[PDB]
Amino acid sequence: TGAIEGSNVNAVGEMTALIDLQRQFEMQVKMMSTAEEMDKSSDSLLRM
């Protein structure tokens, strides 16, 4: 009694999770870009 319990959020734990989520997000975006790049190249097969 006479005290209030705050939150247990570990600020560093969230920040290091953020930077890893950013890098993994960006790497998958590159996978999307190289997927359409391959698709565009494999379109001259029907380009007689």
């Binding site: 698709d39 494999s42 379109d43 097969l45 029907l46 007689m48």
Partner: protein
């Protein structure tokens, strides 16, 4: 002898089958993005036999679908369409030369 069948050979039935195959291949390409659509294959040997005198084949996917259910491998469809067009062009040349040779003999020109 001296008949159009014995003269043209199987180059008249083959052309029809090659156009049939192109219709099937083009259908798979168009229906690539439709979920639940299963890729359709065509047996050339059976179709040629049926054409000479006169069932559904599905293509096994190389990899699982991403959830939609469509088993159309657009990389393979383009390759087969390119091959079908080349062999169809040869069949037209083969069949076209049958008529030219027949006309050449009946006129001596």
């Amino acid at each position: 002898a001296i008949s159009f069948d014995n003269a043209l050979g199987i180059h008249q039935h083959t052309v029809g089958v090659r156009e049939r195959n192109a219709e099937v291949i083009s259908t798979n390409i168009a229906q690539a993005n439709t979920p639940g659509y299963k890729a359709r294959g065509l047996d050339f040997a059976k179709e040629l036999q049926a054409a000479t005198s006169g069932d559904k084949l599905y293509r096994l996917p190389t990899q699982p679908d991403t959830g939609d259910g469509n088993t159309v491998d657009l990389d393979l469809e383009r390759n087969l369409f390119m091959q079908n067009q080349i062999r169809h062009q040869a069949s037209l040349d083969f069949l076209g030369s049958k008529f030219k040779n027949l006309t050449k003999a009946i006129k001596g020109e």
